[PDB]
Design a binder for this molecule. Structure first.
Ligand SMILES: CC(=O)N[C@@H]1[C@@H](O)[C@H](O[C@@H]2O[C@H](CO)[C@@H](O)[C@H](O)[C@H]2NC(C)=O)[C@@H](CO)O[C@H]1O
Ligand SMILES: [Ca+2]
Ligand SMILES: [Cl-]
Ligand SMILES: [Mg+2]
Length: 524
């Protein structure tokens, strides 16, 4: 039988948790692979909707109706009906997701193959959001203990791989669903998932040809990995923004004083050599992002160039100008250590964090630390475990953090996740908006992005968002990165690549297109 060796997320050890709602404790082969979505949007191809469990959807003259494919059965033989979708959306309406429920007011079963979704506000992006919610078996989950602390070790599933073949703390094997509706399109028998804690461990394995489908950072990829075998390939199409995020609500006076000063964020930004960061840390694998709004050149067409030009000096390498701005603002060194102190005369050191084992970001931070020291800003690096890293952002105890962002077909994915202040509160919230900068006009502009179908007005919305973020230098954007993807042609063929660019190729959870991707691979 064919086994596909994948690596969607680093772990020290595997805990048997296949619950789709628990995205902080589950295995990252649960969404898509076990619970197939209604629709997959091919974001690389203009969000073209690829229909799976749903046959179609129809916005009413305004709310949506989904039609659900017939003859579709769960893993245990029981049939997939509207009742299963109905029971699923119903369940998060009274037990909160991460997806966000701020868009759907209840659900009607209307037909055992048609479901009515009632809308809170009106949003043309709402099928994209509905697609994120996992549909679970009604005939199974309606039992359940506490649906919130429920490991799902033996999962009833709709997706391609539902059988747990093997399960050690360093290896688990996830095999073909017995009653899979698309099994005719499926030629991979099993997902084979090894436990890998960080990039150093990954690197030995990938260079030894032990992997099939991976998305980790690989330093000097052409020398280390590609040169080791003719079967060793990769394809890095462009992805989203990377930046230093600063905490506007730091609990230390001096640090708060520094971080909340726009002069100081702009001097911080100007000391950075973004091209050198790309060159050394990412081995050339990226593009300088000198948009103060973090827009990035892939969305250059969306850009109000007046705004970009106006603030780009603040987002270009200019240590001398960084030194002058610090002095004009009042960050004077008054204790003879060569490091500027706050206007009220306090010494400080910024602690800059990135996740343990994400060595590309670790190196970016260490590069920035030295760059900062050159213009007299004192900083130190920290590389905590992702969960610690993430937690420090959620509770606002960090100073400065290097982070990447998710990336969409337009700039809304980046701008909303990164700046909508409503995403600063909750408890299943991601790290992305946790600078705690807040602007009602910015939030209003974001909230109205998909409110009108006037492309011209949507574009004026973008320019208004761009201007607000840029003039306030809310973060320090550094670069635009790549979709890291490595593939082995030793055991399989049919891979997406530069010659076959059918969509986002990565294996990470959060890329629904990985389902469509595995449906193209054939054993060799
Ligand atoms: C936007 C986001 O949070 N994406 C996450 C990915 O960055 C992350 O993958 C890891 O990214 C690091 C930084 O570039 C790499 O150093 C690292 O190799 C890579 N790890 C893997 C297994 O791909 C993944 C997984 O941690 O989570 C994504 O959500
Ligand atoms: Ca000093
Ligand atoms: Cl800009
Ligand atoms: Mg196929």
């Amino acid at each position: 039988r064919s086994e596909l060796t994948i690596h969607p997320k680093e772990f020290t050890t595997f805990v048997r948790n296949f619950n789709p709602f628990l995205g902080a404790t589950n295995l990252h082969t649960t969404t898509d692979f076990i619970y197939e979505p209604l629709v997959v949007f091919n974001e690389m191809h203009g969000n073209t909707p690829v229909f799976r469990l749903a046959e179609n959807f129809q916005m009413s003259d305004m709310s949506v109706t989904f039609d659900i494919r017939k003859g579709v059965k769960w893993s245990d033989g029981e049939a997939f009906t509207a009742d299963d979708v109905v029971y699923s959306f119903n369940l998060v309406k009274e037990k909160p997701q991460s997806g966000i429920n701020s868009w759907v007011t209840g659900v009607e079963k209307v037909n055992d193959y048609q479901v009515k979704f009632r809308l809170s506000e009106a949003n043309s992006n709402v099928p994209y959001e509905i697609a994120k919610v996992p549909v679970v078996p009604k005939h199974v989950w309606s039992k359940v203990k506490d649906p919130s602390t429920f490991t799902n070790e033996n999962p009833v599933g709709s997706g391609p791989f539902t059988v747990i073949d093997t399960f050690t703390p360093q290896l688990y094997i996830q095999c073909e669903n017995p009653n899979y509706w698309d099994a005719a399109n499926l030629d991979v028998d099993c997902l084979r998932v090894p436990q890998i804690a960080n990039n150093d461990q990954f690197l030995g394995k990938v260079v030894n040809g032990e992997m099939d489908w991976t998305s980790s950072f690989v330093p000097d990829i052409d020398r280390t990995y590609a040169a080791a075998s003719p079967k060793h390939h990769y394809w890095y199409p462009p992805a989203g923004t990377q930046a230093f995020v600063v905490n506007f609500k730091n609990p230390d006076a001096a640090k708060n004083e520094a971080l909340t000063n726009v002069d100081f964020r702009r001097a911080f930004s100007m000391a950075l050599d973004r091209q050198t960061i790309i060159d050394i840390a990412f081995y050339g694998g990226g593009t300088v992002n000198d948009f103060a709004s973090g827009l990035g050149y892939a969305f250059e067409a969306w850009s109000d160039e007046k705004t970009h030009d106006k603030f780009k000096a603040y987002n270009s390498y200019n240590a001398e100008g960084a030194k002058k701005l610090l002095a004009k603002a009042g960050f004077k060194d008054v204790n003879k250590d060569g490091f500027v102190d706050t206007p009220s005369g306090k010494s400080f050191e910024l602690l800059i964090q990135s996740p343990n084992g994400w060595t590309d970001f670790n190196n970016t931070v260490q590069l920035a630390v030295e760059q900062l020291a050159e213009v007299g800003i004192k900083a130190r690096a920290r590389t905590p475990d992702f969960s610690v890293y993430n937690q420090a952002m959620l509770e606002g105890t960090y100073d400065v953090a290097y982070t990447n962002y998710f990336h969409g077909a337009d700039p809304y994915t980046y701008w909303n996740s990164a700046y909508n202040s409503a995403l600063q509160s909750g408890d299943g919230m991601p790290r992305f908006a946790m600078h705690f900068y807040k602007n009602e006009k910015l939030d209003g502009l974001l909230n109205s992005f998909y409110k009108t179908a006037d492309k011209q007005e949507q574009l004026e919305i973008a320019h208004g968002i761009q201007q607000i973020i840029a003039q306030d230098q809310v973060t320090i954007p550094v670069l635009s990165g790549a979709y890291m993807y490595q593939y082995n042609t030793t055991r399989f063929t049919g891979w997406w690549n530069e010659e076959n660019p059918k969509g986002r190729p990565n294996i990470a959870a959060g890329i629904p297109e990985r389902l469509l991707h595995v449906l193209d691979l054939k054993p060799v």
